[PDB]
Amino acid sequence: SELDQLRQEAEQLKNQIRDARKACADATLSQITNNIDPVGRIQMRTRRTLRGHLAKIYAMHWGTDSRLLVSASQDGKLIIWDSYTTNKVHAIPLRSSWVMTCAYAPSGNYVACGGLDNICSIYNLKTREGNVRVSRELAGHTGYLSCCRFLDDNQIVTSSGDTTCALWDIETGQQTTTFTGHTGDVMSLSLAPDTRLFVSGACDASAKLWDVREGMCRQTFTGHESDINAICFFPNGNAFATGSDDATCRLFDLRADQELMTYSHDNIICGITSVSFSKSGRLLLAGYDDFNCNVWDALKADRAGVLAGHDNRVSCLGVTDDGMAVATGSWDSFLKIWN
Amino acid sequence: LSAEDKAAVERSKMIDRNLREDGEKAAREVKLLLLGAGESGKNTIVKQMKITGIVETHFTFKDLHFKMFDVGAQRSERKKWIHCFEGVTAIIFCVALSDYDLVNRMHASMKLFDSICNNKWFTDTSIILFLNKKDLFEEKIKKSPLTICYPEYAGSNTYEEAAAYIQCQFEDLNKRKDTKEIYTHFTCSTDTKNVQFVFDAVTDVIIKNNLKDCGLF
């Protein structure tokens, strides 16, 4: 028996799960979506241009008010941008300039940042002293932090470059739940509207669904052939999409446990950095390494819009909860508001 | 027109002034990236310098501020975070000369150097080669020949020729020879010498970028 029998059993589970996935296969969404009319070409313009940053912008996130957004760039500065009037509400200097992830708390009282440093710093915005100060130093990780997202005013879920994903609480500063299912490096995270399930993609082309409370792998997806660099949640909370360096985007449904479609075009051959969804879910916006940001129809899976307002790699892409505007940031140190 | 937003605009102007000052400050400073296999190899030059994630080393030499980033402790796939160091002036790559007799490790260093050299992100960044363990290599030559892991090698076993052979074996992997320039140098026990070589190489690279911007390269 020994490792031979165990490996054969694992292979048998793999075949059984593949056959089960084939069992529910009914029809590709493309044919059923033929009934609904196409969205058509979408003309998009940049209403505001944020030129405060001077280095490459890596990550950004919108607030719950759909007005304030937080930007992270390699120069080691976080800027809170007022979208309506293009004003810098706050400027937070970072001890570690190598920052590639940031998030905005749902209540708008806390922000988080991280990157090549193994510490996920938490900053307070509403300090009575009037200045921004560090609240917690989550330094329990070993690998580089790639994505951190606020789950509540006292709980934050973060993913590191190692094979472990950790859930942290602000009050104590210790790891509550640790997930070790992934084998590669986790790049991006996404929190469902319910705030009970969250997906995670790793470099091994594996997307896994994790439960915040119970803490085990609920779903697995292996439709991609390369690293999952971008991942986001569909607004309804039952579907999610992934972006990879293979120049293709894909949409998965938790209930179906299958890849419903893949978004790609022959001309596009470079990787994908960030992905986001619109309020209605019709529009699937994803950044690309080229000097272009592509908007796809999530249902028909076709190129619906083209944003060529950038001259460098597009890295971050955030969509307001109300869908009033979309902000796209690139490595050109310029952030533009689009709608 | 506005009533209270003028104060916000003024505050934004102060923030912009501070950001511009910090940007000029950072632009004046020069960045260096550390790479190699084996902690002692990198720590040797760090100790030789004269004034947990990445380790930041700041030192002023000849009125120039040097920022050296040690990324050897990350232990993560370089393919997903090497692009962060696109703008670094030079990459200090360290390889121990005495590592050839240890288990194969010289072959691993050669693969690491090949991967770093052929990276698309480092297409216009120079690499500074620091061959550590100079004395240990000379002691090793008298006991073990270089031909154990170098079957193609055929020549006398001496310090000069062995060092030259290792140098030219590390040099050929630079496929894009026209753009990049490898400034190989042997680590010296005497202080105030390696830093001189690093400063000279960085000055040469900066002159090259200046001439590129002029319109001559």
């Epitope: 007005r67 304030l68 007022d82 004003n87 509400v89 706050h90 708008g108 009575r128 002293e129 009037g130 200045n131 | 506005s2 009533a3 209270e4 937003d5 003028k6 104060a7 916000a8 003024e10 505050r11 102007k13 102060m14």
Partner: single-chain antibody, 233 residues
Framework: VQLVESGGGLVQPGGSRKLSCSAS????????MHWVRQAPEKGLEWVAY????????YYADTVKGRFTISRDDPKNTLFLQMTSLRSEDTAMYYC??????????????WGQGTTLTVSASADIVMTQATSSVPVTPGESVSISCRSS???????????LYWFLQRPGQSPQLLIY???NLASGVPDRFSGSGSGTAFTLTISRLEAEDVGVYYC?????????FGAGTKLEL
């Protein structure tokens, strides 16, 4: 957070002196400063304002030119120089901090104040409906006010501030912009308005509510105060 004023005292007619205020517990550099004086028998009234960058210095119509305000950010202290003082200048002066950004709560902290005494148009006029209303514990009191000009700015926010000054201490901010609660204020307080008619409702009054309530507008540059309504336990 502490704003301790000093330097007041007795001044002969047409005299001069320098009021000082040392700031601690907060970033003085970021916060702009306001000066408000209260006459022994009258209400509050704004004097001058200095922004964070020491620019856009504003002065009241009745004190323009005569008074001057300066700051020294390394020194972490505020200076208020006055000369050729008049009889009406006798009042208790408070230094008030203020930060200006989206979601801010300006005028959220007031100093203990310094006393000054002297030996023997085109502004916003706020009409106070009442000056004294007897109340009892456990009841509800509503205070109504009228403004000469509508304060509903095109941006959607109204510039209204409510301050409460109990006997023996400086005024305390209750509600700013008639839609937000200041830090440390019990949630029982509430405010509403229609652009011109403003009402302040204090449900479930306790004994600590005894004091005089002052209204303030921040639409136009010249800040003004109301006559003040005093509540009797």
């Amino acid at each position: 957070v502490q704003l301790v004023e000093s330097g007041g005292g007795l001044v002969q007619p047409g005299g001069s002196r320098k009021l000082s205020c040392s700031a601690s517990g907060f970033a003085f550099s970021s916060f702009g400063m306001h000066w408000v004086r209260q006459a022994p028998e009258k209400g509050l009234e704004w004097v001058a304002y200095i922004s964070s960058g020491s620019g856009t210095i504003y002065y009241a119509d009745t004190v323009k030119g005569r008074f001057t305000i300066s700051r020294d950010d390394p020194k972490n202290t505020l200076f208020l120089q006055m000369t050729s003082l008049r009889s009406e200048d006798t009042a208790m002066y408070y230094c008030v901090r203020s930060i200006y950004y989206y979601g801010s709560s300006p005028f959220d902290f007031w100093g203990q104040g310094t006393t000054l005494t002297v030996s023997a148009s085109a502004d916003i006029v706020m009409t106070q409906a009442t000056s004294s209303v007897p109340v009892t514990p456990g009841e509800s009191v509503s205070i109504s006010c009228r403004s000469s000009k509508s304060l509903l700015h095109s941006n959607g926010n109204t510039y209204l501030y409510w301050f409460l000054q109990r006997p023996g201490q400086s005024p305390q901010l209750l509600i700013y912009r008639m839609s937000n609660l200041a830090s440390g204020v019990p949630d029982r307080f509430s405010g509403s308005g229609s652009g011109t008619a403003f009402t302040l409702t204090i449900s479930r009054l306790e004994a600590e509510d005894v004091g005089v309530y002052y209204c303030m507008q921040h639409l136009e540059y010249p800040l003004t105060f109301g006559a003040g309504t005093k509540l009797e336990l």
